[PDB]
């Protein structure tokens, strides 16, 4: 019942009992919340309420202290003082308190319904109190809401893998797609996607008519570390100890091992195939001594750290930690190996010489606090991106979200820049790199490679169905099938586009290989074939299409619906 204020930090007995995570504020703080919402209900050791039998007023601009007791207007004693009044609310420390001038944000950020992208702008450009408060209300707010869709229950099971549902009346249904992960009864998780139903489980179970599918609502702890810590600057590399030779392989980024070594935490951008797994395994190679730990928020992301240290790292000194398929190549849940792989959620409390984050992109302020509370390191290293992609935010609807409110690490790099940028695409084909290059990095992404002439666009806008709010466009597919009768080289292709049930379609006609461009990130493929399948928001974000058309190695063909866009590929165009 005493903490510190969500604002200021001062002591305080006071809660404001209408926000849902109950935060502390000052009497000072306390007061401006109250005067401008409409939350009014404080809480103490006691709660503001009117003591008198039968009153059922709760709110503390109408409450007064009588004695050691609370009563409102029509039942305070003639010796009472009001519990609001100066500018500030009664309760302990009421000297001490200091106030804020950041109110006007808390207000925002305690009564929004995360539905407008400018809540989320408002929770990456508050005070460093401010953004931990929004992190733990947003993902309050996002479980509760998992409360309101309807459950699932097996009408009949057609196979190993479709299935017919009834889904309970009254209540909205999920969209069905490799996002909304189902808990089943606990038979274990589910995911669907689409009459019938194609169904995938984490196990094998015979499924019985009647079990039934809920989507898992996680509770919320609270956060107390900072998304980034204070930093710091050293004359020197601090707590790390350099090799005296490392291999030419990794001699490039010799000048940005020793800048991690000098600073608390570093920044690292790196555009699609620059090197950025290459420069997390060779900051162990370069300081061999360091314990080190690996995170991301997904368990693709920490497999693909795995994979690279499989190659230049001693196999002994790992470990995968492991609370769905992951690496396997390592001891298991080892914690106290020199190098440790592991997602934010499953990361144990430990210490380390050197943090690396990576695809920080996808990350989000909540991730960043417990990666902070969780690692008590020397250094910190985010890697990423903000040019690609980031975390779904399940309740926006309003707006979109740009990359410098992403999280903390992203609006960094958006504002004053990286602390290191990889400048050099490794895996594109030329046209690929100078399209992205002009794109979203301002012409400084430069190409290694060749221009491949196996880059093509064609711009047709074709036929637009839906399955629900999931977009098809068969004549778009059409074109792809008649492009794979004259080029045959492609039938090892893989298929991506923004929307699930293109790619289901795709899927059945073409026979290749999909991907969402969700999905997609952080893989690589020697062909891709993209169709845009509608010119929505979504489909056009700079951001999605960057990252859909730099999975390719070798060549890409775009069939485009958006006539900006198809300009700027820098492809071949072909006709048909
Ligand atoms: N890998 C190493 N090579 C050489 N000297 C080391 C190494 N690790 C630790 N030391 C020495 O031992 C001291 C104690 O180590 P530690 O408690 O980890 O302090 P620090 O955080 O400064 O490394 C270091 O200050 C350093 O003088
Ligand atoms: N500075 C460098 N020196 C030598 N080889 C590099 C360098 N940077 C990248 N590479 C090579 O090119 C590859 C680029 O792919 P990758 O590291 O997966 O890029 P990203 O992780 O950014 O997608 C590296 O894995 C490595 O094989
Ligand atoms: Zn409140
Ligand atoms: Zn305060
Ligand atoms: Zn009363």
Not at 75 to 87: E, M, Q, T, V, W
Not at 124 to 136: H, Q
Not at 347 to 368: G, H, K
Not at 374 to 401: C, M
Request: glycine share 6%; aromatic share 10%; charged share 20%.
């Amino acid at each position: 019942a005493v903490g510190a204020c969500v604002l200021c930090n001062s002591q305080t007995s006071l809660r404001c009992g209408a926000c849902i995570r109950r935060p502390f504020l000052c009497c000072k703080c306390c007061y401006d919340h109250v005067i401008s919402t409409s939350h009014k209900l404080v809480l103490s050791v006691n709660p503001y309420v009117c003591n008198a039998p039968g009153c059922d007023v709760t709110d503390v601009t109408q409450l007064y202290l009588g004695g050691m007791s609370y009563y409102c207007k029509s039942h305070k004693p003639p010796i009472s003082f009001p519990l609001c009044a100066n500018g500030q609310v009664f309760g302990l420390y009421k000297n001490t308190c200091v106030g804020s001038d950041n109110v006007t944000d808390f207000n925002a950020i305690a009564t929004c319904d995360w539905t407008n992208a400018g809540d989320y702008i408002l929770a990456n450009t508050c005070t460093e109190r401010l953004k931990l408060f929004a992190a733990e209300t947003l993902k309050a707010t996002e479980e509760t809401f998992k409360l309101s869709y309807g459950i699932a229950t097996v009408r009949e099971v057609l196979s190993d893998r479709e299935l017919h549902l009834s889904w309970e009346v009254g209540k909205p249904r999920p969209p069905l797609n490799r996002n909304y992960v189902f808990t089943g009864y606990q038979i274990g998780e589910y995911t669907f996607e689409k009459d019938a139903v194609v169904y995938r489980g984490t196990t094998t179970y015979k499924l019985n008519v009647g079990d039934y599918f809920v989507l898992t609502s996680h509770t919320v702890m609270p956060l107390s570390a900072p998304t980034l810590v204070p930093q710091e600057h050293y004359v020197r590399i601090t707590g790390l100890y350099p090799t005296l030779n490392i291999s030419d392989e990794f001699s490039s980024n010799v000048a940005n091992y020793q800048k991690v070594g000098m600073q608390k935490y570093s920044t690292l951008q790196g555009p699609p195939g620059t090197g950025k797994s290459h420069f997390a395994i060779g900051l162990a190679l370069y300081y061999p001594s360091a314990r080190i730990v690996y995170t991301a928020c997904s368990h693709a992301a920490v497999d693909a750290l795995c994979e690279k240290a499989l190659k230049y790292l001693p196999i002994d000194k790992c470990s995968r930690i492991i609370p769905v398929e992951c690496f396997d190549k390592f001891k298991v849940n080892s914690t106290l190996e020199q190098y440790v792989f592991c997602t934010v959620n499953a990361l144990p409390e430990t210490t380390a010489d050197i943090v690396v984050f990576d695809e920080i992109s996808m990350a989000t302020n909540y991730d960043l606090s417990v990666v902070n509370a969780r690692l008590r390191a020397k250094h910190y290293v985010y890697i990423g991106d903000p040019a690609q992609l980031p975390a779904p935010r399940t309740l926006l609807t309003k707006g979109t979200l740009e990359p410098e409110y992403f999280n903390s690490v992203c609006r960094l790099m958006k504002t004053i820049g990286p602390d290191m940028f990889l400048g050099t695409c490794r895996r594109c084909p030329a046209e690929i790199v100078d399209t992205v290059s002009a794109l979203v990095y301002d012409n400084k992404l430069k190409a290694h490679k060749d221009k491949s002439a196996q880059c093509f666009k064609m711009f047709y806008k074709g036929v637009i169905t839906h399955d629900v709010s999931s977009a098809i466009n068969r004549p778009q597919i059409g074109v792809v099938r008649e492009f794979l009768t004259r080029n045959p080289a492609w039938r090892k292709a893989v298929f991506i586009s923004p929307y699930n049930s293109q790619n289901a379609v795709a899927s059945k006609i073409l026979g290749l290989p999909t991907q969402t461009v969700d999905s997609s990130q952080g893989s690589e493929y020697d062909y891709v074939i993209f169709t845009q399948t509608t010119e929505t928001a979504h489909s056009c974000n700079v951001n999605r299409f960057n990252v859909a058309i730099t999975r390719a190695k070798v060549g890409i063909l775009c069939i485009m619906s958006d006539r900006d866009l198809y300009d700027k590929l820098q492809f071949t165009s072909l006709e048909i």
